[PDB]
Structure formats: C-alpha cells, structure tokens
Symmetry: D2
Subunit: 145 residues, 4 copies
C-alpha cells in the first residue's frame, strides 16, 4: 500500500530545507517525535545513516539529494501496525519544491510498503499529517515577519 | 539555460487536470495564447501531436502522463529570442501535484534549452508566469464556491 | 509486489524503439501474445488507449514518452493469478536505453501491484521473460548483418 | 550541452556497485584518474563531500542513492575546456542497473552543463569513455571465473 500527503508552507524553500535537511535532526516535529537517536556510523547527510525515533522506529537513510531537496529512508522497525512482522520494504520519501510566485514551499511526503493488509494506511496518514502539521505551524504566514 | 515557475491553485487536482490535460486545448490561458491550431496527426493526448500557437510557436508533444499528470513538449519554432536560429532542444514540462491538506493544486512549469546566450531566460519567465497567472485566476479561493 | 526484468539487445536503440513503440502493435512477441485488439479511442501513442491481448489481458496506456522511450500501462483485467479479483493497481513500465559503446539496446520491464499475496510474482516474471526473449531473438548479434 | 555514455559490464550489479559506490574511492579508473583527494568534511557517501582529482577536478557530491545505485556531483573546478571560466552548472550522474537475464550490469554516465559553446562535448565524451572502459576492463567476461 501507499500514502501521500502534502502541504504548502509560508517560508522560502531555502529556509524550510535548512530546517529539515538533517536526517539526525527531527526537532522540527515535536508533537509526534519525542526522541531521535543516531544509530550506526555516518552523519545527517550520509546514506547508510540510521536513527531510532521514540525508541521504536528504526530508519535507515537510503537516498539523499541536496540538489532535489529529498530525503528517502527505509523503516526497518516500527510499532504495530508497521512492525517488521506485518509489513516489508517500507520506503519514505520527503521532498520540497519552491512555490515561486510568492516564494513559499510545497512539501510532499510519500510512503509505500508491501503487506497482506491495508491496516497501516490510516495509521501512516495520521503520522505524516502530524509531522507536516508541525512543519507548517513552525512557518506561518505571520511567523514570516 | 532553464526556467522554473510554480503556483498554488485553489481547486482540487482532478479539476485543474481536467482543464489543462488536452495538448490541443489552450483556452485556459487567454492572456497570452490567442490561437491554438492542431498540426499533424494525433489528438490532444497523442505523443507526436503538434500545435501552432499565436501563429508562431510550433510545439510537438514528446511525452504525456495521465498517471503523473504531466505534459512535455519540444518548442520547434518560436519568435525571437526563442527562434530555432538562436536556441535548440527546447523542452517544456508542465506538471500538477495535489496539495492534500486542503485539496488544492500545485502547478510547476519547467523549460530548458541550449543556447549561446541567456537572452531567452527573462522572456520565458515572463511567458510562463503569464500562463500560470491565467490558470490561477480561473481557479480562485472564491471561484471555488 | 513487483517484478523487474531486463536484457541487452544487439541492435541500435532507434531500431528497437521503432519496433516496440506502438501500444497497439504487439507483433514482436509472438510466443506469448497471440492477439492484440485495439479497444476504445486513441491510437498507438495516445494516452488513454486500450488493448485486449489473448482475449484476457485488458491494458490501458497511462503514460508514453517518445523522448525517454517509455510506455506505461495499467492492467485492468487479466487471467488468474493477475485477475482484478486478486490484485489491484497493476502498472507495467517498459523502457529502452542505448548502450552507446557498441550501439546496442538495454531493455527494462517493471511491474508493480497491490495484493494480499505474492502469488503473481513468479507468474509475471515468466510472462516478462518470455516477452523480452522474443524481442532479443528478433535482434540477434547475427541478425544485425 | 550534455553527454551520455554507457556500457555493459560482465559482473553482477552488487559487485559493480560495491566497487564504485564510494565517492572518495576512484581507484577503479586508473587510466585517467591518478589521484583522488578528499576535501571538506563527510565520507564517501555523505552528500556535501568533495574531492580533488588529478589536482585539477574539484567535485562535490550533490546526491547519492543506495537504493537506485546512483552518484550525482557538481564539477566545481576543472581544466580547460571545463574550467569554471568557460562552463557552469556542471552535473555528472553515474548510475547502475542490473541486466537480469544473465546477471550482468548496465552502467550509464550522464553529464550536463551550461556554456556559450559545445567545445567541452568531445572532451567529456573522451573522459567518460575512458572511465567506463576501465570499469569494463576490470570486470571481463573471463575475469568472472
């Protein structure tokens, strides 16, 4: 199955990227993400780097693009209904584009995986919408004053 | 050289696509496009189809994606400073994405070409911004009532 | 689930493309494809075009790229284990690249779908390998004399 | 302008990738590359990493994909005719695909840049063909014994 969620953020793309570009800095989504621990070697832009979030999501960075402003990762472990016992080949894909007419930012987040069920679809929609909502709340049409 | 312009349109992506999806229907950008004539065989979604706009832009459809909502074309002839005597390998790339949180539409338009100069850069920025501005004006935050 | 199969064909990419580029001409894979009937409007390069193969595979063209030499389609109906009762969102993706050093052709064919099982994986591997094998047999290192 | 060169290598894709996957290890192309020095922070898979080759090519890693087996970089400095005084926005794109039928590897290398001339086209074709030729020579149809 797969999910796709997107929002427009009232801040220039360079600023939004500067904030989210580090695979080991998730401080920008404090609602859902309570802890983000580096695991394995490699820094925040090093493909192969890993992280553990909330003590239960284990992610590996599988692709990074400075030029396209994209971060892609596998979710290697997670809580039900996205545990490794119920899904496989989970790939997350977070990507920015400029909205040039008013110098804002389009943010898209895709997820896809294999599974015998669609049980995880609602759950990841909820997760991604929360993460994106934090990102938007940080860059408001008035927070840009 | 290349150009990139984008806007957010206050209408659902299915509606925006329905309006722009036909390579031979350019009625949605009346400010700059005064006439759009079919040239050669193939309909509005047929790769290889061609069109003449304003009696001076000759375009060929070189790629079309219903699934990705993308139209790509070569500009084979055009007025200075985008005539075939001054540039080559012009490719235009028009593409939609949904903004899911509020059910709006992100629209991006890219152009790239080869040239001894950048003289065409300002000119195409002006063209694309006008075309996109028509698209936005048609789908206003209030025109969605 | 998904499948991916590829081969190298001893013929220039322009020749291979010329042979496979028509969504309604499948005469190049006579082993598995016994009949290919046009369904609905639109010609062989018209996105939206449909075809029925062997009286049981119903395909729709969902993307076409002359510039990238790619054909993408949904399989809307098929025999078990790829019937619409057992899988959904089947997308096939057939794409050519030149092998420039000796002027040959790389051919890749991808398939992906959603399903409660992987039962269709072996089956589509078998189908794609047969189709590609026909393509190769037609363009041999000696058939290029 | 741009260049595109490709070859088929008689070795499995995992082996070819293992050999070329490190932005700071260029030992696989000894014909043209005599020295490869790390510059700046970040390791061989860290986007932002830089290198100096032959004391004259300064490259920065701008994208890396483990999942797609791709390395992309900007050439920030180089000898004429690819010096920063004569070209700009040089991007190199090195990418592997499996040839599944016989378990070999397709290798493609693209380059693109902006320039008032095409003088660099022949020159980069020559460079890329040499680099690829080293890669092939290392993995021969008999070196796989």
């Amino acid at each position: 199955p797969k999910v796709y969620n997107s929002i427009v953020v009232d801040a220039p793309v360079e600023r939004v990227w500067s904030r989210i570009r580090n695979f080991h800095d998730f401080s920008w989504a404090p609602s859902l993400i309570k802890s983000c621990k580096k695991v394995g070697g490699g820094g925040g832009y090093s493909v192969g780097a890993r992280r553990l979030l909330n003590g239960e999501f284990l992610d590996t960075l599988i692709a990074y693009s400075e030029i396209e402003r994209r971060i892609m990762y596998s979710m290697d472990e997670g809580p039900s209904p996205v545990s490794s016992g119920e899904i496989y080949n989970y790939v997350g894909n977070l990507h920015l584009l400029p909205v040039t007419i008013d110098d804002t930012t389009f943010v898209e987040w895709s997820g896809s995986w294999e599974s015998a069920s669609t049980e995880a679809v609602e759950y990841m929609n909820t997760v991604y919408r929360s993460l994106l909502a934090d990102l938007a709340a940080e860059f408001t049409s008035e927070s840009r004053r």
